[PDB]
Enzyme design. Structure first.
Site, PDB file in Angstrom:
ATOM      1  N   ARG A 125     -44.491 -54.531 -27.352  1.00 11.10           N
ATOM      2  CA  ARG A 125     -43.602 -54.024 -26.287  1.00 11.10           C
ATOM      3  C   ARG A 125     -43.579 -55.183 -25.228  1.00 11.10           C
ATOM      4  O   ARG A 125     -44.625 -55.750 -24.931  1.00 11.10           O
ATOM      5  CB  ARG A 125     -44.116 -52.789 -25.581  1.00 11.10           C
ATOM      6  CG  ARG A 125     -44.201 -51.404 -26.202  1.00 11.10           C
ATOM      7  CD  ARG A 125     -42.973 -50.940 -26.877  1.00 11.10           C
ATOM      8  NE  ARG A 125     -41.739 -51.085 -26.154  1.00 11.10           N
ATOM      9  CZ  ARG A 125     -41.296 -50.564 -25.032  1.00 11.10           C
ATOM     10  NH1 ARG A 125     -41.990 -49.720 -24.271  1.00 11.10           N
ATOM     11  NH2 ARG A 125     -40.063 -50.912 -24.599  1.00 11.10           N
TER      12      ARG A 125
ATOM     13  N   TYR B 239     -48.002 -55.264 -24.843  1.00 13.97           N
ATOM     14  CA  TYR B 239     -49.011 -54.695 -25.741  1.00 13.97           C
ATOM     15  C   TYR B 239     -48.399 -54.367 -27.114  1.00 13.97           C
ATOM     16  O   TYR B 239     -47.233 -53.992 -27.257  1.00 13.97           O
ATOM     17  CB  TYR B 239     -49.783 -53.511 -25.163  1.00 13.97           C
ATOM     18  CG  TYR B 239     -48.833 -52.379 -24.799  1.00 13.97           C
ATOM     19  CD1 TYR B 239     -48.397 -51.447 -25.715  1.00 13.97           C
ATOM     20  CD2 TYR B 239     -48.384 -52.302 -23.481  1.00 13.97           C
ATOM     21  CE1 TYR B 239     -47.486 -50.456 -25.383  1.00 13.97           C
ATOM     22  CE2 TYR B 239     -47.488 -51.296 -23.103  1.00 13.97           C
ATOM     23  CZ  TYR B 239     -47.048 -50.385 -24.065  1.00 13.97           C
ATOM     24  OH  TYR B 239     -46.183 -49.428 -23.620  1.00 13.97           O
TER      25      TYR B 239
ATOM     26  N   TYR C 256     -53.634 -49.252 -20.934  1.00 16.16           N
ATOM     27  CA  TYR C 256     -53.308 -48.027 -20.138  1.00 16.16           C
ATOM     28  C   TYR C 256     -54.618 -47.234 -19.930  1.00 16.16           C
ATOM     29  O   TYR C 256     -55.453 -47.164 -20.823  1.00 16.16           O
ATOM     30  CB  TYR C 256     -52.305 -47.115 -20.823  1.00 16.16           C
ATOM     31  CG  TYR C 256     -50.869 -47.513 -20.856  1.00 16.16           C
ATOM     32  CD1 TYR C 256     -50.348 -48.276 -21.901  1.00 16.16           C
ATOM     33  CD2 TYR C 256     -49.997 -47.101 -19.867  1.00 16.16           C
ATOM     34  CE1 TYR C 256     -48.997 -48.626 -21.952  1.00 16.16           C
ATOM     35  CE2 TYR C 256     -48.626 -47.446 -19.894  1.00 16.16           C
ATOM     36  CZ  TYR C 256     -48.155 -48.213 -20.933  1.00 16.16           C
ATOM     37  OH  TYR C 256     -46.833 -48.572 -20.990  1.00 16.16           O
TER      38      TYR C 256
ATOM     39  N   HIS D 125     -43.509 -53.792 -19.239  1.00 22.01           N
ATOM     40  CA  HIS D 125     -42.546 -52.807 -18.683  1.00 22.01           C
ATOM     41  C   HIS D 125     -43.185 -51.794 -17.763  1.00 22.01           C
ATOM     42  O   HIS D 125     -44.402 -51.577 -17.826  1.00 22.01           O
ATOM     43  CB  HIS D 125     -41.794 -52.075 -19.828  1.00 22.01           C
ATOM     44  CG  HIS D 125     -42.775 -51.306 -20.671  1.00 22.01           C
ATOM     45  ND1 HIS D 125     -43.535 -51.842 -21.657  1.00 22.01           N
ATOM     46  CD2 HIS D 125     -43.093 -49.957 -20.613  1.00 22.01           C
ATOM     47  CE1 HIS D 125     -44.281 -50.880 -22.203  1.00 22.01           C
ATOM     48  NE2 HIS D 125     -44.016 -49.750 -21.591  1.00 22.01           N
TER      49      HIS D 125
ATOM     50  N   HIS E 221     -42.730 -47.786 -16.571  1.00 19.78           N
ATOM     51  CA  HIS E 221     -41.989 -46.522 -16.889  1.00 19.78           C
ATOM     52  C   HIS E 221     -41.542 -45.874 -15.555  1.00 19.78           C
ATOM     53  O   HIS E 221     -42.320 -45.842 -14.592  1.00 19.78           O
ATOM     54  CB  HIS E 221     -42.774 -45.500 -17.688  1.00 19.78           C
ATOM     55  CG  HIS E 221     -43.269 -46.010 -19.011  1.00 19.78           C
ATOM     56  ND1 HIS E 221     -42.609 -45.789 -20.202  1.00 19.78           N
ATOM     57  CD2 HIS E 221     -44.396 -46.698 -19.315  1.00 19.78           C
ATOM     58  CE1 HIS E 221     -43.275 -46.352 -21.170  1.00 19.78           C
ATOM     59  NE2 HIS E 221     -44.363 -46.899 -20.656  1.00 19.78           N
TER      60      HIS E 221
HETATM   61  O1  LIG Z   1     -42.854 -44.481 -28.689  1.00 12.56           O
HETATM   62  C1  LIG Z   1     -43.862 -45.165 -28.823  1.00 12.56           C
HETATM   63  O2  LIG Z   1     -44.506 -45.066 -29.897  1.00 12.56           O
HETATM   64  C2  LIG Z   1     -44.308 -46.078 -27.680  1.00 12.56           C
HETATM   65  C3  LIG Z   1     -45.477 -46.853 -27.774  1.00 12.56           C
HETATM   66  C4  LIG Z   1     -45.846 -47.664 -26.715  1.00 12.56           C
HETATM   67  C5  LIG Z   1     -45.063 -47.722 -25.547  1.00 12.56           C
HETATM   68  C6  LIG Z   1     -43.932 -46.941 -25.420  1.00 12.56           C
HETATM   69  O3  LIG Z   1     -43.192 -46.944 -24.287  1.00 12.56           O
HETATM   70  C7  LIG Z   1     -43.522 -46.127 -26.495  1.00 12.56           C
HETATM   71 FE   LIG Z   2     -45.550 -48.177 -22.114  1.00 14.09          FE
END
Ligand SMILES: O=C(O)c1cccc(O)c1
Ligand SMILES: [Fe+3]
Ligand SMILES: O=C(O)c1cccc(O)c1
Ligand SMILES: O=C(O)c1cccc(O)c1
Ligand SMILES: O=C(O)c1cccc(O)c1
Ligand SMILES: O=C(O)c1cccc(O)c1
Ligand SMILES: O=C(O)c1cccc(O)c1
Ligand SMILES: O=C(O)c1cccc(O)c1
Ligand SMILES: [Fe+3]
Ligand SMILES: [Fe+3]
Ligand SMILES: [Fe+3]
Lengths: 233, 200, 233, 200, 233, 200, 200
Positions: free
Chosen positions: A154, A144, A105, A157, A159
């Site tokens: 994860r 990642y 990111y 995805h 968002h």
């Molecule tokens: O809530 C998290 O810690 C988290 C970490 C990475 C991606 C994501 O969507 C959420």
């Molecule tokens: Fe994310």
């Protein structure tokens, strides 16, 4: 100014993830211990901003051009926004953000070892049309790792944030890719108790929308709370 | 029973929410037009105020990656839905907490009074939506003002909260910042003095 | 005085609803956080009051006359009280209360807009006979909305309290009506994790017991903790 | 293994319990005979006492709709199970918390000692069952007297509680009410000072 | 004046109840013994009255206000009127009648012992909108006993009358309530041979359409004969 | 084959149909506007007539709770579909039989001639629908006039009834009530002289 | 719903019912004690009458293999359940129709008035059950008297029969046989003047 003329079907809090989902570590300390207080809908809740006059850039929705060409799988992400009654949601704000092809990111706090892509930012926005349609052109994000369990990853995805006709309909979510083996292993995905609900989050490969010799396409429709006129109030 | 299409399930905003909804805050180049924390321009009618606050987790630690959405009426108790940067007043705004100080600020005006469905007036208030990593589905709250005690006592919304002690959790404390009228509104997600969150 | 001669089958705390059932909002702040302390049964726990000599009015169990005629569906609620061993529990106290046909309770704090019925009170008591049989004559209560989730409605129900032979057997419960579509959506109902346990709370239409051209009937049997003699103690 | 018929599942008493079990309290016309909070007639043997207390929830807020049932031995440490209004003393009683003050009261005598199954004597005590909206299955507790430390020290029941600190939550505090011997027993359903609740 | 432009799909007389259904005692002497004579559709059969100019009162469709408040379960009865082709039937007349909460009708001939409700008449009418939608506000009727077999009870129901576009589509029926145990034992209901046909007569609980803290809602859709243009006549 | 959505099944009107469709007859207060038995205002064109009849069951006993609906063309052989209480003539009407005498009446005009789909003229007629307890699905019939024999002999509809003797059941018999032109039309649901009922 | 054990299904008596229930009639040797058609002994209190009749099928033909059972009150309007040949009066009897003439006879007393469950008096009557080949489940009827016109008019039972013309099927016609008071009661199972049969 806005007027209180609508009622929104009540949210099913058994459908949506609960606040406390211990496998998702951070939810432990960031979830309320007291019950939510139910309140009737008033104009405060049944109204929301309309973004029709926001000044969108020409490539607001094209991540291939809005930041050279980015490296990764060229895809179009399209779908429609409808309410629970199956009614299209026109001129609604659809925002999205994601990592690059490597799972990196473009954020100060992202220290993952996969490199940044000099031609990719990872943010887009689009106002749905008269039929509730939206579309973006981007590259497929990579999965990642993250500090949850000692080996959590994860699934790839995107968002998403959706406005809808009111603050009662506003929603933040994440789209997953069809067939990703990581999906069923995810503690965040697993915050959703019903498997059927999980299915709603998976974009489907859409060959019909692809551009031959150019890019693939995925379809992701979104359902917002049903809107109805008030009656015998 | 009758079943409609189920709503798309919520998911946490995650830690990088800023890249998508708070460009400046993520420290990335912004676009021409952004939805930010300034609801009113200097020449907007009403009493100009500054809103600020902190967000706490269940451990009393500062939540430094929170994202907040606000919706309020203008000084005439009117909701301005047509969002435009040209406008003197916008009823909608966005704010976020510093990765450092972890404090959010908003520049707006004190909202006029609005009636509930039954025709009963609600005390001046600001509708808040809280988002962040660790929060699966966003939290809905309301910000009330300490200098509106009379109105506050008759609020049909405030009155639905069974325990008087919990109502206090919703009242912002009037202060002054650089001789500017300010109200501090802290959010405690969990534990002692846990802020009231709604469902609607 | 009373004497310690019986022992009562330990309660199955997985069968009964647990203390903390989040969907039922009020249980949150009203459920212990420490484990219950188990203790051996003594005369303190294995004895209880006997109401054989209580002075019951002649219409104590007749809600149609004990408060004109109430408006609503005229029904008879009858059944038997047995223990887990299938033994009748004779001369035990059965008490019940309910809302009227519109779901309105005759109580101070009930501010639901359905009106009160001038001929209806909503309370009855009956002492089981030698076979463990009890019977009531009432009107079927209406479902009612309550402040839980934004649109929660209690299934139509009659509240029950049964003494039994000891304080170890005393019970408070609710009776629901066969086929009511609200049943499966009620969070109080759902405090009971086993679907089989729920079934036990459902009164069955009993045509055999009805008075033709007059009133219908519902059968509701109650099972109290099994009672046995002490042995090798 | 062997399985018996399953017991009928418990359900909360709900907020209107009063209409069925505490008519006076609900402010409704009562019947000829009602089971209430005066266990002993003035001419009943034993030390007449007044019991009073409040009920708190996990937030430290008063539970104003609780319903309690009590069972105790008389002065001669005997259980009078034959309930009659004509009796001078009844082993069984009922009380409820004021929708206002939120306090319950009972009129009885200090119970005599009774022995356990093993033949070991238990300190004088009153068995209580608490009902209320929010409580799925009623809570069992015992009331003990602070002026019976000796006995309390030997109690086979009280000694079953692992942590001594938890034992104190069961001891009523001796006081006087209008120059009448009273004892105050406050129940804490959850949290700090949570009262011991039994299973049997 | 009206014009012969339409043809209506022939009725399925095996779907609808037959004339002679002996369990329903009265049908015995009130059913023809000769076969119906089939006749071609003409302007006589393909036209019917249009009630667009009927002067409806403002509470014609609100049984709570059209006769204090009635005692009983407050519900909204809503749905849509479509044809067999699934096309909406706009501006059509929907009439309804029913008993009060105790199963008593405000009619001379009803001597059932359940009393009348001083604030309830039990009659309504509503003209469908542009989309074929109708809606009534009332109280849930109670079941009632009738002189058929010695212990016969009609399930709770609302009588319905629907005009449609012609005398060819005009229909009278009854709405029943989801989960009512009486349904399967009623000889009137049983006049309908196909279980699947019975299902169409059952109104489903509709929580989406309910007014929180006020009343429930039931959904009842009506399908009238399919209407098509004439061809090669 | 192709299957469409099934039509909602018919059900008997029941004994209390008057309450919803024959307000006056139920002996209940009516609304401002009701659909009743006067199709023609006295000043409407055509030959004003009075229609009356009885309805018999299979035992020859009067059906005193029947409900009927009528549809006919005006004297010019035209269907007036826009229903209005203001109109001098309405094509649609409603009647019912007396709980006492068990006789129905209708105030109208003699219908003009209409053509069938083929272009062939039908004899003057009134379309009738009969509803009542014991009738699962309503019965359709036609009322023809005895003084229109010529036209009747050539009716394409009447001609579809195989048996000549059966056609007779659809012919109303001319009479006079208080020096007013009347036609009597009795309906025999079952048995000897059973009325012809149609399917379309 | 609740379901009990299903009742054993009925079956026709068959053509040979006499061998089992009317020995004499079957033309077989009888036992010491038989249940027959002489309910009252000459010394029994009340008005001694003779009852007679024929049973007809739907074609108007005599049913010469019928079996009948009767239940009636004594002259005081009392049901005598304790069956004994010694009794001067038995409330129960049996008769059958001649394979020849096809007529049954009964020797009894005129029953007294009995009240229904609601305390309303029923006119004098005899409860009858009819059995025969071709009858799957027996038919229940009641015999009333033509000389109890005043009472008949007020019977809550007779008054349940919707059509007065049908009530007359239940009325026995008073005559004399050999100078004795007789009543003739014919039963028509089907068709013209079909006798009312009951369900209870
Ligand atoms: O809530 C998290 O810690 C988290 C970490 C990475 C991606 C994501 O969507 C959420
Ligand atoms: Fe994310
Ligand atoms: O799982 C929950 O929703 C919950 C809610 C409140 C307290 C608690 O321990 C758990
Ligand atoms: O869910 C429970 O039963 C429970 C019991 C004790 C503590 C706790 O957090 C939860
Ligand atoms: O526990 C409650 O809050 C409640 C509310 C209504 C009915 C009932 O049985 C219980
Ligand atoms: O069941 C029928 O539809 C029927 C129709 C005609 C004569 C008859 O006995 C029976
Ligand atoms: O046909 C009937 O006798 C009947 C009786 C009651 C209700 C109803 O719809 C019909
Ligand atoms: O009904 C008959 O004709 C019959 C004939 C033989 C045996 C029987 O049970 C019945
Ligand atoms: Fe309740
Ligand atoms: Fe009906
Ligand atoms: Fe045989």
């Amino acid at each position: 100014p806005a007027q209180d003329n609508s009622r929104f079907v009540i949210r099913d809090r058994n459908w949506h993830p609960k606040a406390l989902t211990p496998d998702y570590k951070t939810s432990i300390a960031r979830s309320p211990r007291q019950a939510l207080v139910s309140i009737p809908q008033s104009i405060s809740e049944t109204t929301g901003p309309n973004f029709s006059h926001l000044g969108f850039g020409a490539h607001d929705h094209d991540l291939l051009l809005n930041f050279g060409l980015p490296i990764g799988e060229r895809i179009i992400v399209a779908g429609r926004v409808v309410d629970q009654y199956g009614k299209p949601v026109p001129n609604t704000l659809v925002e999205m953000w994601q990592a690059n092809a490597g799972g990196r990111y473009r954020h100060k706090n992202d220290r993952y070892l996969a490199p940044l892509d000099p031609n990719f930012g990872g943010v887009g926005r689009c106002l749905t049309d008269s039929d509730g349609y939206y579309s973006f052109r981007t590259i497929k994000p990579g999965p990642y790792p993250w500090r949850n369990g000692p080996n959590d990853w994860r699934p790839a995805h995107i968002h998403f944030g959706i406005s809808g006709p009111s603050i009662a309909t506003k929603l933040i979510t994440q789209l997953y890719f069809e067939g990703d083996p990581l999906i069923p292993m995810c503690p965040i995905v697993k915050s959703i108790a019903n498997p059927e609900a999980v299915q709603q989050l998976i974009a489907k490969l859409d060959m019909n929308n692809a551009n031959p010799m150019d890019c693939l396409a995925y379809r992701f429709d979104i359902v917002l709370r049903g809107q109805r006129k008030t009656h015998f109030e | 029973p009758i079943e409609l299409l189920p709503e798309t399930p919520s998911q946490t905003a995650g830690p990088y929410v800023h890249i998508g909804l708070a460009l400046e805050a993520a420290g990335n180049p912004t676009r021409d037009q952004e939805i930010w924390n300034r609801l009113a321009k200097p020449d907007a009618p009403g009493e100009h105020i500054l809103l600020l606050g902190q967000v706490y987790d269940g451990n009393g630690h500062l939540v430094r990656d929170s994202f907040l959405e606000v919706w309020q009426a203008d000084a005439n108790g009117e909701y301005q839905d047509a969002y435009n940067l040209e406008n003197a007043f916008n009823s909608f705004g966005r704010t976020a907490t510093t990765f450092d100080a972890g404090e959010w600020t908003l520049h707006t005006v004190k909202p006029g009074v609005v009636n509930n469905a039954a025709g009963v007036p609600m005390a001046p208030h600001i509708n808040i939506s809280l988002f962040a990593r660790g929060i699966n589905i966003h939290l809905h709250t309301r910000l009330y003002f300490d200098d509106e005690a009379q109105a506050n006592a008759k609020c049909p919304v405030l009155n639905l909260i069974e325990q008087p002690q919990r109502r206090e959790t919703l009242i912002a404390k009037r202060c002054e910042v650089d001789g500017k009228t300010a109200y501090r509104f802290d959010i405690r997600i969990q534990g002692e003095g846990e802020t009231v969150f709604f469902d609607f």
